[PDB]
Each structure stands twice: as C-alpha cells, then as structure tokens.
Amino acid sequence: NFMLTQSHSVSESPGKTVTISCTRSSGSIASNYVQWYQQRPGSSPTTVIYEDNQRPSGVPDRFSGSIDSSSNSASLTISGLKTEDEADYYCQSYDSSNHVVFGGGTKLTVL
C-alpha cells in the first residue's frame, strides 16, 4: 500500500538530542498508528513508542514520538542520549488490510 522511508543513519554525542524521521509514501501518516522499535546490536526489536506517542512501561521519558501531518512523517526523538540508546530504530505502521509495513531502519551511533 505504501512504504515508510526513514531518515539517514546518525551519530551524536552522549547527553545530546537526536530526531529520526519516517515518511509515509502514500496515504496519510495519520491514518494508521505508528510504532517505533529499538533493536540493539545482536538483539531483537522492542517497542519504544506505540500508537504514535505512547511509551511502554519501562521506556524512559527521554523517548518521544510525534506525527507531522504537513510532511506526512512520524518522528522519534531521544534526548539525553545514552550509549545504551545505540541501536537500529524502525518505524512501523499498518496498511488498509492491516498488514504490517516496516520502515527500512535508521542506525543511531552514540559518539
């Protein structure tokens, strides 16, 4: 139905803030919930954001999700970058038949 195009891999110093973006290619980004997963090297994906901006229990408030209707994108912002945040991040949403669509992933390196 569409693809989710994520922003380029980024490097950032500890304590800083980084924002990763996820652009839906057709149809409104606001038409289906966006989730964000963190996948640390060698590990499995875990939710950091679901329903656009909800944090699961145990995910700290340094993580926040947003939706920008004008750019048809979703964004994940991580402030207070810790070296434990070094991971590949994936945005994910659903098409009309409720099939999962994954973004292509963004690598975050903590300098």
- Binding residues for its own copies, rule: CB under 8 A, are 35, 37, 43-47, 50, 56, 90, 92, 99-100, 102-105
Q: Which stretch binds Na ion (CB under 5 A): 11-19, 62-70, 75-83, 99-107?
A: 62-70
Helix (H, G, I), strand (E, B) or coil at 69: helix
How many residues does the structure list for the chain? 111
- Residue 80 touches which of its own copies, Na ion, none (CB < 5 to 8 A by kind)? none
Q: Give the residue with the Cβ less far from its own copies, 70 or 98.
A: 98
Shortest spacing between CB 1 and its own copies, in angstroms: 10
Pair 104, 6: CB distance under 8 Å: yes
Alpha-carbon span 91 to 75, nearest angstrom? 9
Alpha-carbon span 72 to 87, nearest angstrom? 24
